[PDB]
């Protein structure tokens, strides 16, 4: 999860919006098209998700490390 | 041979970079040509 | 030399080949294919190739197979018109 | 086992090459 967060932290919204455009073309070609148009996460949401996953990954890594290092006793 | 490194390493790592950075600093902000 | 339609202009075959009538190219291509296949089969298929079995004639014949393909394509191009 | 003369002539040829590099760069002409 910590490594996964870097995907949101480093990248920007435009790339993902264009990739979603291509995927939406693929869906439309088969007459599958959600009425709720897909959108790449807003810039602020991209940062928030990256930070949340970064914190979860770090906290969980240290959580497991400490608990397994101090429960083998 | 066995004397050169003492002479050159200081020149290549101190004197050469020092003079090079001095000249580059002079040229970057020369304000003419 | 960009061409549309179903058959390229003869000028694609080059100055020499473009003047050869289709039947001549067809017979030449058949002869070349036969010789090349026969050479490739005589050495390394019907007979194992060794250090002292390298026949220049068979090497030339084997090289003649792509010439056979080119000549058969050229024969078709000449045939369409 | 390269003698000091060999090192010195290598240094001389390197200096000549360095001067040529100086001139080439100058001629690229910023």
């Amino acid at each position: 999860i910590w490594a996964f967060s870097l995907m949101f932290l480093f990248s920007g919204r435009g790339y993902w919006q264009e990739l979603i455009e291509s995927i939406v073309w693929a869906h439309n070609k088969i007459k599958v098209a959600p009425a709720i148009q897909p959108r790449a996460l807003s810039i602020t949401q991209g940062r928030a998700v990256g930070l949340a996953h970064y914190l979860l990954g770090g906290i969980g890594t240290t959580w497991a490390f400490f608990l397994a290092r101090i429960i083998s006793v | 041979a066995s004397y050169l490194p003492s002479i050159l390493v200081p020149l290549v790592g101190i004197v050469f970079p020092g003079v090079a950075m001095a000249l580059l600093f002079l040229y970057i902000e020369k304000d003419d040509i | 030399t960009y061409w549309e339609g179903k058959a390229p202009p003869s000028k694609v075959l080059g100055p020499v080949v473009s003047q050869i009538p289709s039947p001549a190219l067809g017979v030449i291509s058949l002869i070349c294919l036969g010789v090349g296949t026969y050479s490739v089969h005589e050495s390394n298929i019907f007979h194992t190739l060794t250090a002292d079995t390298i026949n220049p004639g068979y090497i030339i014949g084997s090289l003649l197979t792509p010439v056979a393909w080119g000549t058969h394509v050229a024969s078709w191009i000449q045939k369409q018109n | 086992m390269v003698t000091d003369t060999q090192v010195f002539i290598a240094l001389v040829l390197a200096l000549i090459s360095a001067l040529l590099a100086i001139r080439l760069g100058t001629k690229l002409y910023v």
Binding site: - | G18, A22, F25, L26, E29, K30, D31 | - | -
Partner: protein, 88 residues
């Protein structure tokens, strides 16, 4: 320069790699001299870059005189610090 030369021998003398050798003070003095030379190079290049188109200190000649004075005073300060520390 006098202020900053006397000031600079001490750190090299007492915390340099040769601090524990009987030649610590001389190594510190030499390090201070080298650093002073570097700083005077810095001053000269700064003067030649900043003020290019005797007076207030913000001029080519004014800054050149300031730098010469700084070098002389810094070497004086380093030498005086060495002299003082040599017997203490």
């Amino acid at each position: 320069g006098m202020a900053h030369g006397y000031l600079l021998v001490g750190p090299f003398d007492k915390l340099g790699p040769l601090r524990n050798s009987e030649i610590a003070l001389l190594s510190g003095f030499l390090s201070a001299v080298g650093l002073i030379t570097i700083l005077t190079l810095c001053l000269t290049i700064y003067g030649k870059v900043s003020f290019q188109e005797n007076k207030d200190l913000l001029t080519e000649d004014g800054w050149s005189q300031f730098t010469s004075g700084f070098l002389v005073g810094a070497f004086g300060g380093a030498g005086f610090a060495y002299l003082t520390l040599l017997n203490l």
